[PDB]
């Protein structure tokens, strides 16, 4: 009694892969068959289920859409057949036999990894800041490598609103902007330093660097009142 | 001088959407134009530039291959095609003029939301678990809603193998599971308790409601050695 999967690989996004699972030991036709998945260094996440000709197959909300399950029972066969694929679709792929309230996912197979692929990191800290009017909120923008001819730039954002440009070049500021928003820093260490705050400074910041062709923002520093 | 924005709404998994974005006020038709977007609750993150035609347009990994950029100069638009949409997906979706060291991201669109979309939460606790060989670990699976039929089972799994079945029905042993293993509950509220813990135990270990078309898993629990 045994479920023998086969396929997997890398692939690029927006490609496609075909998966299958051979069964033996048990009547196929009369079991429900699932597919479930495993994120690297995650948990195991349902990904679709079939049953019999005419009943109802089913798909988890992030394959749906894109991935079809069937089966060809003269072949003992389940296929998964992954199409627009995406690198949030990279996992081990198991088929399971489903057994229901006499047990379960009794039965899987070993599990075939697909991986769908294609960098300056920056970590902004501290996460949050709360601090009270008029006082001075100072944000850390550490980027994993040198950031070419200091291009980079804080932006401000408002619940509800899109970013607002504060400083570019590191420590230009933007039309509009107050003195007390100042930019500073070189290589991979960059401050944007808030003095005097005042109610409306109360907001997330992102860092942004522009030094590259693949451009990346820090997760953001929240300001909020004490 | 503004990028006026239309679009989005909400679509189900594979649908499509097409964005766009009117540009007035300056040289659009040699202007690098990029999408920036923003998931619920979460950072900015760029999807994708383009620029004049003798440059090439370029994609975050994230959504390459099943989304287009593109522009219309003649009618100062810019467009973001997007196929085979995920829940992922779900974001803000702004345009932005790039201006690079003459200022970064100096003009942005208001953003559309773009959300994708088509439930048994369980709880594992503690998240990990230090013992020692000869102890006694015991795991906690609590269910959001009641699991009809007290149809859940446990799952032991070892680096680089598949699940392995332990317990069904809440508390029915599988076939060739020591009797060191006992699941217990009913309802919302199960336990699997090993006594004696043996070095071959230590794994991760995943809880699984099977009571409904929608089937879920806990997010494990790391039993450990100390």
């Known amino acids: 009694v045994q479920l023998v999967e086969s396929g997997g690989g890398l692939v690029q996004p927006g490609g496609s892969l075909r998966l299958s699972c051979a069964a033996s030991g048990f009547t196929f036709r009369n079991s429900a068959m699932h597919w479930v998945r495993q994120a690297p260094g995650k948990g195991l996440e349902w990904?679709?289920?079939?049953?019999?000709?005419?009943?109802?197959?089913?798909?988890?909300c992030s394959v749906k859409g894109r991935f079809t399950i069937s089966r060809d029972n003269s072949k003992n066969t389940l296929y998964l057949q992954m199409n627009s694929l995406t690198a949030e679709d990279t996992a081990v792929?198991?088929?399971?036999?489903?057994?229901?309230?006499?047990?379960?996912?009794?039965?899987?197979?070993?599990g075939t990894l697909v991986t769908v692929s294609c960098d300056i990191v920056l970590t902004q800290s501290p996460a949050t800041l709360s601090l009270s009017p008029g006082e001075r909120a100072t944000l850390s923008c550490r980027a994993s490598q040198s950031v070419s001819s200091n291009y980079l730039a804080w932006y401000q954002q408002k619940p509800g609103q899109a970013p607002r440009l504060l400083i570019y070049?590191?420590?230009s500021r933007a039309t509009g902007v107050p003195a007390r928003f100042s930019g500073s820093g070189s290589g991979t260490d960059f401050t944007l330093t808030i003095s005097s705050l005042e109610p409306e400074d109360f907001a997330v910041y992102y860092c942004?660097?522009?030094?590259?062709?693949?451009?990346?923002f820090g997760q953001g520093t929240k300001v909020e009142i004490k | 001088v503004q990028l006026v924005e239309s679009g989005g709404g909400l679509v189900q998994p594979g649908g499509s959407l097409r964005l766009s974005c009117a540009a007035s006020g300056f040289t659009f038709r040699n202007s690098a134009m990029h999408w920036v977007r923003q998931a619920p609750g979460k950072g900015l993150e760029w999807v994708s530039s383009?620029?004049?035609?003798?440059?090439?347009?370029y994609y975050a990994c994230s959504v390459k291959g099943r989304f287009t950029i593109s522009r219309d100069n003649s009618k100062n638009t810019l467009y973001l095609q997007m196929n085979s949409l995920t829940a992922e997906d779900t974001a803000v979706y702004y345009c932005?003029?790039?201006?690079?060291?003459?200022?970064?991201?100096?003009?942005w669109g208001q953003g559309t939301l773009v959300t994708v979309s088509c439930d048994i939460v369980l709880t594992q606790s503690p998240a990990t678990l230090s013992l020692s060989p000869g102890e006694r670990a015991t795991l906690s699976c609590r269910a959001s809603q009641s699991v009809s039929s007290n149809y859940l089972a446990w799952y032991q799994q070892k680096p680089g193998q598949a699940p392995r079945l332990?317990?069904?029905?809440?508390?029915?042993?599988?076939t060739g599971v020591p009797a060191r293993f006992s699941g217990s509950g009913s309802g919302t509220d199960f336990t699997l308790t090993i006594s004696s813990l043996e070095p071959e135990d230590f794994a991760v270990?995943?809880?699984?409601?099977?009571?409904?078309?929608?089937?879920?898993?806990?997010?494990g629990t790391k039993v450990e050695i100390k």
């Open positions: 383009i620029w004049y035609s003798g440059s090439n347009t």
């Open positions: 942004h660097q522009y030094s590259d062709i693949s451009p990346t």
């Open positions: 070049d590191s420590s």
């Open positions: 932005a003029r790039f201006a690079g060291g003459w200022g970064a991201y100096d003009v």
